[PDB]
Every structure is written in structure tokens, then in C-alpha cells.
Amino acid sequence: AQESKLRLKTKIGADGRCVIEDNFFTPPFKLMAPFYPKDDLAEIMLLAVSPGMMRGDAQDVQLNIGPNCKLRITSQSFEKIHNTEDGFASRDMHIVVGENAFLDFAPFPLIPFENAHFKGNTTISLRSSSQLLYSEIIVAGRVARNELFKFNRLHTKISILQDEKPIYYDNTILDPKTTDLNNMCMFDGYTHYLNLVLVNCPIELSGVRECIEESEGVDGAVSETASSHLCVKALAKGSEPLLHLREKIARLVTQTTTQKV
Amino acid sequence: NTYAQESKLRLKTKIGADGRCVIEDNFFTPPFKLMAPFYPKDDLAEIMLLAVSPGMMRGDAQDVQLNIGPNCKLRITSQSFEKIHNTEDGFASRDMHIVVGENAFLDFAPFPLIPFENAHFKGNTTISLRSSSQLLYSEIIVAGRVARNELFKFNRLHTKISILQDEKPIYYDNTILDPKTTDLNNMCMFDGYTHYLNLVLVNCPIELSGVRECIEESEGVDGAVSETASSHLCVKALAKGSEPLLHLREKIARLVTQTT
Amino acid sequence: NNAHVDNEFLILQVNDAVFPIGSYTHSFGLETYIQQKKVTNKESALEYLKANLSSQFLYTEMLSLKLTYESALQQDLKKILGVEEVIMLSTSPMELRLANQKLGNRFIKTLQAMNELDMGEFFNAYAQKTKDPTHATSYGVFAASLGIELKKALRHYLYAQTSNMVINCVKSVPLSQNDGQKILLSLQSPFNQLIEKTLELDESHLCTASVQNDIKAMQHESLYSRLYMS
Amino acid sequence: NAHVDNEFLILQVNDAVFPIGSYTHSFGLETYIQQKKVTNKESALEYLKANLSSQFLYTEMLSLKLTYESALQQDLKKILGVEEVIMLSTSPMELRLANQKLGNRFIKTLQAMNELDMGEFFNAYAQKTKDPTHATSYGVFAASLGIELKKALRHYLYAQTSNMVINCVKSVPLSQNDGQKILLSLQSPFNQLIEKTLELDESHLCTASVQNDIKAMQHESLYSRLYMS
Structure with a gap:
């Protein structure tokens, strides 16, 4: 059992750019210094190389995007959940987005191995002027070895508050023992979910x-x-088409200029 | 006079030597009375059944037996209505057994029923026909004495008809009229009318x-x-009166009679 | 067998307004009442339903349903066929007779089309011998064969048939859909009294003659413009 | 006249002709049909088992039970809590709208029946509710009248499934006997779903469906749509 922590707080700097005010991380997490795609957009790369999560492992993420900060966090890492036996692994995220701030974020795509038990809880606090692009990808398992829905149980939740008032809920519960997750109302023969x-x-x-x-x-x-x-x-049926889709969407949300109204 | 009366009516007909429908045998008790047959068409006899009576009371019973011989073509006519009085804890009844023979024809109907307040009447009619037999039978029920606004005040009326052809049932009627269980004036029963055919x-x-x-x-x-x-x-x-129904019956009887 | 067949659901299925026996194409004389302007609004519609249920539907449909049910419990097929014969010989209005027999036929053929439903030995025997089943008589045997309690069977049958009649009034009078609901609600006490009465009556009352109802059912044959088969 | 019998009332409100406009909705089924995922008797039964054990179980049946149980305790705040979760959790717009419309019309239909007194708690619920669904409103309805839960669930479950089966028959299309075979096949699953509903608690409320949500959303884009959802 190990605890991986990630903290990131941002603010507009003297140069008018979004910069890191404070940060902290534990293996396998690691942030890179931000760079600036659009004159009105910072990008921080979150990287991670890990064998995966075992019984008792826990991740805690805290994101705090100061006012007027427009930030995109990108990653390439997949989160592998191993056999957790009689226990489980967990991922807790608390995200706060300030006035006229923008955040583009997504946790690592989940790959739950056989008998994996995963619990995720995500809470996102926004202001009325805040802007959010948030997503999650779930995979049926290690598709290459035909390991589909062999995991024990997966339960992840998202709650988004706007000015302290709930505007969106997601309650994802996937349990092969209660349902055929391949039925036409669930995964319907596909293997990757965005x-x-x-x-x-x-x-x-x-x-x-x-x-x-x-x-x-x-x-x-x-x-x-x-x-x-x-x-x-x-x-x-693969992660690439979904990631490509998300990129396109992210691109569409980003093609807005500070030199127009 | 010492107790309830029983009226009887027996009538058997046969083709006579002249080829005419005649009375082979008959019998009747008050108030019943048959008249000698006459002949409207060359192929039809008509016997008038008449009866003058104060009406039936508790215990009174009528028994009717008709036997229309083969090839006989007969019409039995009457003008009398059957008044049923308050029968208290008892009832009045009328039983009829009618037999029509080979290629024989019978045109008949019991007296129209007029049930007074708290009248209890039981009627059973059984009609045995051959496959060649022909029959025109009907019954008329009145809601009561309409002239004194006496509608559906009787106790209970139950009359039945069963018609057998070669000993095989071809028709049933099960008339039960009980003001205490139903509003007999509703739109599925008498529906504002007072006479039923x-x-x-x-x-x-x-x-x-x-x-x-x-x-x-x-x-x-x-x-x-x-x-x-x-x-x-x-x-x-x-x-709303017996006359229109009677006129309707005549038109129909007439139609059935206008034939070779 | 029938270890998977749940009577609680089957009773809902066979009384479902979409159980395919063709009830919706029959008015059983109601259309004649409407065209002649005897049923023109919410109030007259309610009087008709009360008048019909307490006459034709009680002494022929409900009573017969009870009779074939009770006979089925004693495996008395002969008595059941006797009841059906009386009905056929007692129902003078042709379209009314035909409608009931058609619905009887389709009811049984629908049951038999469900291969996974096992109605038992007595129902099969009855289905083989019956000459003139009605929706009500065949239902009676059906219910008894499955061990469905009589009052329950009566309640579901009574409501379904009345619902069909109410919907006909709604379409044909016409009436508002809320009027239909008010009427169905108003009919609940009478519903219960009809069931009470049905349980008291013996076969001597079977096919008690209706008057105007028979007449209007007969008259339906002559309607130039008719949307219903009866 | 003033004698409301629950035995008859439960049949009346679950009657296919109870005027709330169910027949105009497929809740995504139409999408499944046009994309030829539901093309016959076999694929239709698989759809129904799939749908009943997902969307209908964790949202419809589960919420029905939740509002029912809260109604027994006169816990209005909990009922409104449930209805809020459902509204914020149902992303597919035509699915959300459909359920809300049917909830509205259900309450207004009961209201139109003046001789029907639903009691003080239902009256309070109907006044305060903001986003009732057919299932939540019906749950409070059943508890307010003292209708047993399993019985209440049974009628609701059959009635909704019947509507779905009939759409299949009309739209696939299927023979009417096919619909009856299907409805019969589902009786055991029916009992399993009700069994499960009793076991589930609110942590399971609005358990996400995947392809079902996607198909309900895609219904918006169909060029020819005979259904409102």
C-alpha cells in the first residue's frame, strides 16, 4: 500500500500569464513547467510511469485554478488496477475552479484487471463564470488478452457544483457479478467508454x-x-478513437480569441 | 272458492277427411273457452281462444297443452290480457307444453301479462317441434297498470321459453324482472317504455x-x-302501448301467412 | 409445471388492453346508443355503463364466468359445455353472439400460441371439446385451471371490459380523457357490488333477458355508418 | 361514489389508456430499431432484459421504492432530494424531458379527478415538487394510499414493459403473438428485478447506463422519428 498525492494551485502572474503558485507531488506523479499554446492558455503536462495500483493503494488529487487562469492539463498515462483481493484501490479528486477560470482535465484512463476493485470520487467546485472541460475513460480490462469485464467492482462518482449548487451527477457502477456488462444497454460489444x-x-x-x-x-x-x-x-473498441475525439472537442473549445467579443 | 283455482286448456288437432285442420280433442276449465275453427285461407285454420277473468291471485295456476297434428296449419287468436294480482307471500303460475307435428304450423301467444303491485308470476313454456314444423310464437309483458301510474311495482316476474327441434334445443329465453334488484326503466331494459314484445x-x-x-x-x-x-x-x-306491438305482430303474422 | 409462470403477472397480461383478441373493434351495442343520441355526454355515458353492467354483463358475462370457473374446479367439463350452449341459444342479437364467440376463440388461440405456458390437463381437454366458447367462459376455465382466486379473476376481467367501453365512449361520443377517468372512478362502488352480486347468483339467473340492450345490439346490424363490428 | 377502492385504482392508473402519453415515447428504443440492433423477437427480448436490468432498475424502480419509503415516513425533503438527483443525473435530454412530462401529467391527471382524495401528504408533495417523474410521483402515490410496495412495483413494472413490448411489435415490427411470448418470458426476470429493487439502497440511484444513454441522445438526431424519445 502507498499514497500518491498531487497538489496544484495556479494564479495569474505579473506577466499576465497563468503560472504555478504552489505544487506538490509524490510518485508516480510529476508535473512539467507550463508552456503556452495560445496567448490565452497555459498547458501543464502530468506524467506518470507506474506498475499500477494494488490492494490498499490510494490517490489524492487537489487542483485549485485561481481566477482568470486558463489551464489545460495533459497526460499520456493509463491507470492499471491490479487484483486487489479482498481489498480495493481508490482515487479521490477535489477540484476548484475560480472566477473566469478555465480548466481542461481528465484523470488517467482506467484499466481494471481481473478481480480489481476500484473506488473513485471526484468533486468539482466552480463559479458561475468558470469554464470546465472534464472527462473520464473506462476500459473493460486488458482487451489484448481478451480480459473483458473480469474485474471485481468499479465504482466512480462525479459531482459538479456551480456556486455551491449541484449541476451534474455521475454514478458509475460496473459489477460483472450483477450484470452482463456487454449487453446492448451497457458496453454493447465495445470495450472503451468515454x-x-x-x-x-x-x-x-x-x-x-x-x-x-x-x-x-x-x-x-x-x-x-x-x-x-x-x-x-x-x-x-480502442482508446485512440476516443482520445482523438476528445482532442477534437478540446480544440473546438479552445479556438476562441481574446481579440474578439 | 275454498282455495286457489286451476285453469286447464288441452287442444289436439288433426287433418280431417275433408283435408281441413279440425279439433280431434279439446278440454277447458274457466275462464278458458275455445270456439270452433274457421278457415280464412284454404290452407289455414283459426281457433279463437277467449277468456273473461278478474285475474290470477296467490296460488292460482294455469296449465296449457297444445298438440298440432301433422300438416295442420293453425292460428290461435285471443283478445284477453292476463291480470296478475298482489300474490302476497305466494305466486301465480302458467305452464305451457306445446307440441307441433310434421310440416305443421302454429301461430300462438299467451295473454299479454299485466302484473299488479306486488304480483309474483312464474311462467314456464316448453315447445317441441319437428324439423319440418313451423312456428310463430310471442309474448308481451306490460310494466303494470299504466293508467294508474303503476309501473314496475310488482314483486317478481320469471318466465321461461325453451324450444326443441327434434328433441334438440334451438332457443332459450330467461326473463327475470325484479324491481327490487334493478331499475327496470334504465336504458338497457324498458328504457322509458311500458310494453315489451x-x-x-x-x-x-x-x-x-x-x-x-x-x-x-x-x-x-x-x-x-x-x-x-x-x-x-x-x-x-x-x-308505450299494447296496440302498436299487436299491430306489429299482425303485420308479421300476415307476411308469414301470404305463401303457397 | 409452470414453475416460472407467475399468476400475478399472467392475470395482468391476459387482461392487458393490448392482449390481441380484438376487443377494441367491438362496442357490443354502445355505438347504436351513441348514434341514436342516448349517450351524448359524461352523465348519460355513466348511466349506460351502469345499466349495461347490471344487466347484460352481470347475468351473462360475469355469471357465466363464475359458472365455468366453479365447474372447472370440479373438472366438470359437461356442465361447462352446457353453460356455453345455453349462452349461444340465449343470445339472439347476432353481432353480440358473434363478437363473444370470436373473442372466445381468439382468447384460447392466444393462450395456445404461447408454447411455454402450460394450462394443464383440464384446460387442454376443454380447449379441445369446446364448440362455442366466449371470452367470459373460457376465461373462467383459464382462471380456475391456474388456481387464480375467483374475486381477483372477476375484478381484473370486470375492469378491463369496462375500460374498453369507457374508451369507446371517449372516442365515439366524444368525451374528454379526464371524463373517462372520472367515470372509471365513479364505477368503483358499482364494480364491487356487481362482484358481490355475482357471487350470490346461481345458474337460474344465467342469461337473464335484457330488453333495450338486445334491441340496440340487433339494430347495430343496420347502421349505415359503423366503426365497430358490434 | 365516495368509495375509492385501491384494488381498482391501481388498475386504473396503470391502465395503458391512462392519459399521460406513454404511447408517444420509446425512451431510446426507436434509436435501437432504426440502427437495426433490435430486428426480431430474439433481439427485442435481449433489449428488454438489458434495459430493464439497467436504466429501469436503478432509476425507475429504485426511485419508485425510495419515494415510497420516504412517503411512509412523511419525509418530503428526502423525496425532493431523490428527484433532484435524477434530474441532474439524466444527461440524455429527451429521456429527462419524457420522464418529467409523464410525472407532470400523472399528477395533473390525479388532480383532475376531484372525487379522489389523495390525502394530506400527497397534497403537500404535489405542491412542493419541482421535477417529479412518473416513477417518483407514483411511488408517493402508492404509499399515500397504503398500497403494498411489491404490489405497486409489480403493476408499474408490467405496465411499462407492456408499453415497450408494444412499441417493438409496432415498430420492428413483430407479430402480436411474439409480444405475448416475450411478455411471458419476462415473468421470472420481473420477479428478480423486484427482488433486487428491495435490496438496493440510494447509493445505487441512477447507476450509469452506457449505450442506452448514447442511444437516447442519438434519438435527437434521427431524421424520421415517430416517437418523442
Whole structure:
């Protein structure tokens, strides 16, 4: 058992750019210094090389995006959950986004091995002016060795508050022992699952629907939530089509200029 | 006078040496009385059944037996109504057993029923026909003495009809009228009317259209005709008086009679 | 067998408005009442339903349902066929007779089309011998064969048939859908009294004659414009 | 007239003709049909088992039980809590709207029946509710009248499944006997679902479906749609 921690707080610096105010991390996490894609956008790369999580392992992530900061956090790492026996591994994330701040983030895609038990809890606090691109990818297991839905139980939750008021819930429970997760209402023969929410982003439903339609190898869709935001769900047979889809969407949300209204 | 009375009526007919339908045997007790047959058409006898009576009381019973010999073609007519009085804790009854022979024809109907307040009447009619037999039978029930606004005040009325063809049932009727269990004036029963006619035509030379015609051309009548399971005709009609129903019956009897 | 067949669900299925026996194509004389303007609004619709249920539906449908049920419990097939014969010989209005027999036929054929449903030895025997089953008689045997309690069987049958009639009034009068609901709600006490009455009646009351109802059912044959088979 | 019998009332509100517009909804089934994932008797039964054991179990049936149990304790805040979760958890818009419409019309239909007194707690619920669904409102309804839970669930479950089966029959299409075979096949699963519903607690509320959500969303994009969802 080991505890991996990640802390990141950002603020606008004297130069008007988004910079790291404070940070801290434990293996296998490691942040790189930010670089600036658009004059109005910072990007921090989160890297991690790990054998995976075992029984008793825990991850705790805290993100605090100061006001006016527009930040994208990118990674390439997959989170492997091993056989946890009679125990489990867990991932807790607390994210705070400030006034007129933007965050583009996603935890590592989950790959639950046979008899893996995983618990994830994510809470995201936003202001009314905050903007969020948040997503999660779940894989059926190690697809290459035909290890599909062999894990024990997977239970992850997302709750997003806007000015301390709930605007979105997700309650993901996957348990091979209760259901055939391959049935046409769940994974339906696919092996990779993308769930994504766009909150208060400068983008219309039709634009997102265009990306999905023009993405090979994806069965996906978008819809307006009760709180008037966008949710994207997509199934695929590999991770690449889903990651490609997310990139396209992220690109669409980013193609807005500070030199127009 | 020392207790309830029993009226009897027996009538058997046969073709006579002259080829005419005649009375082979008959018998009757008050208030019943048969008159000698006369002959309207060359192929039809008519016997008038008459009766003057104060009405039936508790315990009174009527027994009727008719036997229309082979090839006989007879019409039994009457003008009398049957008044049923308050029968208290008892009832009055009328039993009829009718037998019609080979290629024989019978046109008949018991007296129209007029049940006074708290009258209890039980009627059982059984009709035995041959496959060649022909029959025009009907019954009329009145809601009571309409002249004194006496509607559906009787205790209970239960009359039954069973018609057998070659000993095989071809028709049933089970009339039960009990003001205490139902509003007999509702739109599925008497529906504002006071006179009810139930008529059956068995193996007669007339088409459904013909009967329906008579009904359509009858003022004061809300009635209808339909083919029974055994391929015969049943006519049901409501009226606010006995006369329109009687006139309807005549039209139909007439139609059935106008044939070779 | 029937270790997987749950009577609690089967009773709902066979009384479902979409159980494919064709009830929706029959008015059983109601259409005649409507066209002649005897049933024109919520109030008259309610009187008709009360008048019909307490006459034709009680002494022929419900009573017969009870009779074939009780006979089925004693495996008395002969008595069951006798009851069905009386009904056929007692029902003068042709379209009314035909409608009941059609629905009887389709009810049984629908049961038999469900290969995984095992109605038992007595129902099979009855299904083989029956000449003129009605929806009510065959249902009676059905219910008894499965051990469905009589009052329960009556309640579901009574409500379904009445629902069909109410929906016909709603479509044909026409009435608002809320009017239909008010009516169905108003009919609950009468519903219960009809069941009470049904349980008291013996076969001497079977096919008690209706008057105007028979007439309007007969008259339906002559309607120039008719949307119903009866 | 003033004699409301629950035995008849439960049949009336679950009646296919109870005027709330169920027949106009497929809740995503139409999408499955046009994409030819449901093309026959066999694939339709697989869809129903799949759908019943996912969306209908953790959202419809489970929420029905939740509001029912809270109603027994007159816990209105808990009922509103449940309805809020459902509204914030149901991403597919036509699925969310459908359920909310059916919830609205259900309450207004009961309301239109003046002779039907639903009691003080249901009256309070109906006044305060913001986003009722057919299932939540029906749950409070059943408890308010003292209708047994399993019985309440049974009628609701059959009625909804029947509507789904009938869409399949109309839209696939299937023969009517096919629909009856299916409905019969589902009786054991029915009992299993009710069994499971009793075992589940609110931590399972709105358990995410995957392809079902995606198909409900995609229904918005169909060029020819005969259903509202």
C-alpha cells in the first residue's frame, strides 16, 4: 500500500500569464513547467510511469485554478488496477475552479484487471463564470488478452457544483457479478467508454455533434443537461478513437480569441 | 272458492277427411273457452281462444297443452290480457307444453301479462317441434297498470321459453324482472317504455329483410330483428302501448301467412 | 409445471388492453346508443355503463364466468359445455353472439400460441371439446385451471371490459380523457357490488333477458355508418 | 361514489389508456430499431432484459421504492432530494424531458379527478415538487394510499414493459403473438428485478447506463422519428 498525492494551485502572474503558485507531488506523479499554446492558455503536462495500483493503494488529487487562469492539463498515462483481493484501490479528486477560470482535465484512463476493485470520487467546485472541460475513460480490462469485464467492482462518482449548487451527477457502477456488462444497454460489444462534460464552454451542440459524426471508430452522442451544459458519451473498441475525439472537442473549445467579443 | 283455482286448456288437432285442420280433442276449465275453427285461407285454420277473468291471485295456476297434428296449419287468436294480482307471500303460475307435428304450423301467444303491485308470476313454456314444423310464437309483458301510474311495482316476474327441434334445443329465453334488484326503466331494459314484445319465427317462409321492413313501418315501436344461432328469427320491440306491438305482430303474422 | 409462470403477472397480461383478441373493434351495442343520441355526454355515458353492467354483463358475462370457473374446479367439463350452449341459444342479437364467440376463440388461440405456458390437463381437454366458447367462459376455465382466486379473476376481467367501453365512449361520443377517468372512478362502488352480486347468483339467473340492450345490439346490424363490428 | 377502492385504482392508473402519453415515447428504443440492433423477437427480448436490468432498475424502480419509503415516513425533503438527483443525473435530454412530462401529467391527471382524495401528504408533495417523474410521483402515490410496495412495483413494472413490448411489435415490427411470448418470458426476470429493487439502497440511484444513454441522445438526431424519445 502507498499514497500518491498531487497538489496544484495556479494564479495569474505579473506577466499576465497563468503560472504555478504552489505544487506538490509524490510518485508516480510529476508535473512539467507550463508552456503556452495560445496567448490565452497555459498547458501543464502530468506524467506518470507506474506498475499500477494494488490492494490498499490510494490517490489524492487537489487542483485549485485561481481566477482568470486558463489551464489545460495533459497526460499520456493509463491507470492499471491490479487484483486487489479482498481489498480495493481508490482515487479521490477535489477540484476548484475560480472566477473566469478555465480548466481542461481528465484523470488517467482506467484499466481494471481481473478481480480489481476500484473506488473513485471526484468533486468539482466552480463559479458561475468558470469554464470546465472534464472527462473520464473506462476500459473493460486488458482487451489484448481478451480480459473483458473480469474485474471485481468499479465504482466512480462525479459531482459538479456551480456556486455551491449541484449541476451534474455521475454514478458509475460496473459489477460483472450483477450484470452482463456487454449487453446492448451497457458496453454493447465495445470495450472503451468515454464520459465527458462541457460546462459553460463557448461551443454549440451542433459543433460537438459534428466532431462525433466525423470520428471513425466511435459510437457517440452529445446532449444538453438539465443545467444547460453539454455531456458527451462515446463507446469504442480502442482508446485512440476516443482520445482523438476528445482532442477534437478540446480544440473546438479552445479556438476562441481574446481579440474578439 | 275454498282455495286457489286451476285453469286447464288441452287442444289436439288433426287433418280431417275433408283435408281441413279440425279439433280431434279439446278440454277447458274457466275462464278458458275455445270456439270452433274457421278457415280464412284454404290452407289455414283459426281457433279463437277467449277468456273473461278478474285475474290470477296467490296460488292460482294455469296449465296449457297444445298438440298440432301433422300438416295442420293453425292460428290461435285471443283478445284477453292476463291480470296478475298482489300474490302476497305466494305466486301465480302458467305452464305451457306445446307440441307441433310434421310440416305443421302454429301461430300462438299467451295473454299479454299485466302484473299488479306486488304480483309474483312464474311462467314456464316448453315447445317441441319437428324439423319440418313451423312456428310463430310471442309474448308481451306490460310494466303494470299504466293508467294508474303503476309501473314496475310488482314483486317478481320469471318466465321461461325453451324450444326443441327434434328433441334438440334451438332457443332459450330467461326473463327475470325484479324491481327490487334493478331499475327496470334504465336504458338497457324498458328504457322509458311500458310494453315489451318478444317474438320468434321458427322455420317460416320469410326473410330477415321482410320482418325488418314491418318493424321500420310500425309507428310507436322501437324494435329489431336478428338471426338466432339456429338460423331462425327473433323479434324484440318496445312500445308505450299494447296496440302498436299487436299491430306489429299482425303485420308479421300476415307476411308469414301470404305463401303457397 | 409452470414453475416460472407467475399468476400475478399472467392475470395482468391476459387482461392487458393490448392482449390481441380484438376487443377494441367491438362496442357490443354502445355505438347504436351513441348514434341514436342516448349517450351524448359524461352523465348519460355513466348511466349506460351502469345499466349495461347490471344487466347484460352481470347475468351473462360475469355469471357465466363464475359458472365455468366453479365447474372447472370440479373438472366438470359437461356442465361447462352446457353453460356455453345455453349462452349461444340465449343470445339472439347476432353481432353480440358473434363478437363473444370470436373473442372466445381468439382468447384460447392466444393462450395456445404461447408454447411455454402450460394450462394443464383440464384446460387442454376443454380447449379441445369446446364448440362455442366466449371470452367470459373460457376465461373462467383459464382462471380456475391456474388456481387464480375467483374475486381477483372477476375484478381484473370486470375492469378491463369496462375500460374498453369507457374508451369507446371517449372516442365515439366524444368525451374528454379526464371524463373517462372520472367515470372509471365513479364505477368503483358499482364494480364491487356487481362482484358481490355475482357471487350470490346461481345458474337460474344465467342469461337473464335484457330488453333495450338486445334491441340496440340487433339494430347495430343496420347502421349505415359503423366503426365497430358490434 | 365516495368509495375509492385501491384494488381498482391501481388498475386504473396503470391502465395503458391512462392519459399521460406513454404511447408517444420509446425512451431510446426507436434509436435501437432504426440502427437495426433490435430486428426480431430474439433481439427485442435481449433489449428488454438489458434495459430493464439497467436504466429501469436503478432509476425507475429504485426511485419508485425510495419515494415510497420516504412517503411512509412523511419525509418530503428526502423525496425532493431523490428527484433532484435524477434530474441532474439524466444527461440524455429527451429521456429527462419524457420522464418529467409523464410525472407532470400523472399528477395533473390525479388532480383532475376531484372525487379522489389523495390525502394530506400527497397534497403537500404535489405542491412542493419541482421535477417529479412518473416513477417518483407514483411511488408517493402508492404509499399515500397504503398500497403494498411489491404490489405497486409489480403493476408499474408490467405496465411499462407492456408499453415497450408494444412499441417493438409496432415498430420492428413483430407479430402480436411474439409480444405475448416475450411478455411471458419476462415473468421470472420481473420477479428478480423486484427482488433486487428491495435490496438496493440510494447509493445505487441512477447507476450509469452506457449505450442506452448514447442511444437516447442519438434519438435527437434521427431524421424520421415517430416517437418523442
